Amino acid sequence: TKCYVTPDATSQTCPDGQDICYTKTWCDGFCSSRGKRIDLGCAATCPKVKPGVDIKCCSTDNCNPFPTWKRKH
């Protein structure tokens, strides 16, 4: 499982991962503060130099409930 970024069901989604949590987009946080503004990936190595968008990565299972939509639950 990983951490996803959509409340479609839960936070942690996409099993068969056993690797890392990757979610990225671009919007800093002034375009869609009521959606997501982030994308969903299940491990893909997150480089911090080449892209200019925002890319959060965390090796674990579910990471933290940072990318929320309505609250912090």
Side-chain angles (χ1 to χ4, degrees), residues 44-67:
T45 351
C46 291
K48 257 75 149 61
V49 63
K50 279 217 199 255
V53 300
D54 73 320
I55 322 124
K56 72 185 261 122
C57 246
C58 32
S59 0
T60 169
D61 223 58
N62 312 316
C63 306
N64 73 349
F66 222 149

Side-chain angles (χ1 to χ4, degrees), residues 9-50:
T10 57
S11 292
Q12 61 110 69
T13 352
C14 165
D16 255 271
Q18 226 194 67
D19 284 333
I20 76 77
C21 244
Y22 149 45
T23 44
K24 79 87 217 275
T25 21
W26 61 280
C27 275
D28 186 284
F30 73 101
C31 77
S32 47
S33 349
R34 179 259 218 237
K36 43 227 208 157
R37 321 116 115 220
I38 291 286
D39 112 276
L40 35 142
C42 243
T45 351
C46 291
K48 257 75 149 61
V49 63
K50 279 217 199 255

